[PDB]
Design a protein around this ligand. Structure first.
Ligand SMILES: *[C@@H]1O[C@H](CO)[C@@H](O[C@@H]2O[C@H](CO)[C@@H](O)[C@H](O)[C@H]2NC(C)=O)[C@H](O)[C@H]1NC(C)=O
Ligand SMILES: *[C@@H]1O[C@H](CO)[C@@H](O)[C@H](O)[C@H]1NC(C)=O
Ligand SMILES: [Cl-]
Length: 345
């Protein structure tokens, strides 16, 4: 029925094995159904089985008409948009995913300010910086009511791969227990509402004492401890992201990053998801190597490149330099070849 874990691997539609997928944060904010279906059709014919999307869109005032928004935080209250320019846009993504046999990872808030994020909650509820979000009872109450509304809305759908706490949560210089405690509380809350659906964190994978080279990502300065959080009983698999160019490390360092997380996942007895990765140049050679490493690493059960691209009714989808567009040479290297390789395992 719902997607699950089987040892260090994932199971989808009764098939247990390695899976390739991708990210499209923008799909739930499109307003044209044909574009959503165009994307889902292309993912299906590409063999990409997991699509990670943003399940949040937070604002502190109603946006100009026509702009999609999911939740408004104003006058000390949080209001959820269930209209045509609100959660009905995510509904179409979920429904199209069901039709096209695609499973979705849907997260509930951004650590970053894009689409509001924890900062929009802090603006409305009070405090300073994203870190106050985690321990604020009023913000956690609003965030949990949003979670409940979303989770219950799709309770009868088999297309949700996993509920994810947030995109890239960090707690700079915080004791690792702050995120540990918030992850435990939030994942328990989600499991109470939807016991059979997998839950994951959505973090970058920082804080790792297995085969550390002492570099920034392995250290604990961002408030994260990968092995400690992966032991939470209500977390089903670990997540790691990979951006050497943003972290000041080499491209080859990315393979060790994947290998080390695989070792931690094996030890925890749970799969790891390489949930985001990208570079803005030399896509095929660099990312192809990471893909090979992820596939061959015990403990790593799937990978999603950041990010998918397509030619929509409105022109090409977002290009942040990491985008790999359907039907291009880089797409053949990083999708057609990778999916073929996985199937030839
Ligand atoms: C991160 O979490 C791990 C547990 O997953 C902590 O590792 C333990 O560290 C102590 C010494 O500090 C060792 O005696 C244990 O054997 C370790 N357990 C392991 C690795 O399984 C680590 O200290 C934490 N670091 C933080 C939060 O800064
Ligand atoms: C789920 O299905 C049940 C029974 O078929 C129904 O009563 C419930 O309202 C549905 N929930 C939805 C569509 O969110
Ligand atoms: Cl290309």
């Amino acid at each position: 029925s719902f997607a699950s874990t089987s040892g260090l691997q994932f199971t989808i539609d009764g098939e247990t094995g390695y899976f390739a997928g991708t990210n499209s944060y923008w799909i739930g904010f499109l307003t044209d159904n044909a574009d959503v279906d165009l994307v889902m059709g292309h993912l299906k014919s590409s063999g990409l089985k997991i699509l990670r999307v943003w399940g949040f869109n937070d604002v502190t005032s109603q946006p100009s008409s026509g702009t999609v928004w999911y939740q408004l935080h104003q006058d000390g209250k949080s209001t959820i948009n269930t209209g045509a320019d609100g959660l009905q846009r995510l509904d179409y993504v979920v429904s199209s995913a069901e039709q096209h046999d695609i499973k979705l990872i849907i997260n509930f808030v951004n650590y970053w300010t894009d689409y509001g994020g924890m900062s929009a909650y802090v603006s409305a509820y009070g405090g300073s910086g994203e870190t106050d979000f985690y321990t604020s009872d009023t913000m956690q109450s609003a965030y949990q009511t949003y979670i409940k509304t979303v989770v219950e809305r799709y309770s009868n759908s088999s297309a949700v791969f996993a509920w994810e706490l947030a995109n890239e949560p960090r707690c700079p210089s915080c004791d690792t227990s702050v995120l540990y405690n918030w992850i435990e509380k939030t994942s328990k809350f989600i499991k109470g509402l939807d016991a059979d659906r997998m839950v994951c964190i959505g973090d970058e994978g920082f804080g790792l004492n297995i085969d550390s080279d002492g570099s920034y990502p392995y250290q604990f300065s961002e408030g994260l401890n990968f092995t400690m959080n992966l032991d939470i009983d209500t977390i089903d698999f670990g997540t790691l992201h990979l951006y050497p160019d943003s972290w000041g490390t080499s491209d080859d360092w990315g393979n060790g990053w994947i290998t080390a997380h695989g070792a931690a996942c094996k030890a925890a007895g749970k799969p790891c998801l390489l949930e985001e990765y990208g570079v803005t140049s030399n896509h095929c050679s660099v990312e192809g190597a990471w893909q090979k490493t992820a596939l061959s690493t015990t403990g790593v059960g799937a990978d999603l490149f950041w990010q998918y691209g397509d030619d929509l009714s409105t022109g090409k989808s977002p290009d942040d330099g990491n985008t790999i567009y359907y039907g291009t040479s880089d797409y053949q290297c990083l999708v057609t070849d990778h999916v073929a390789a996985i199937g030839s395992a």
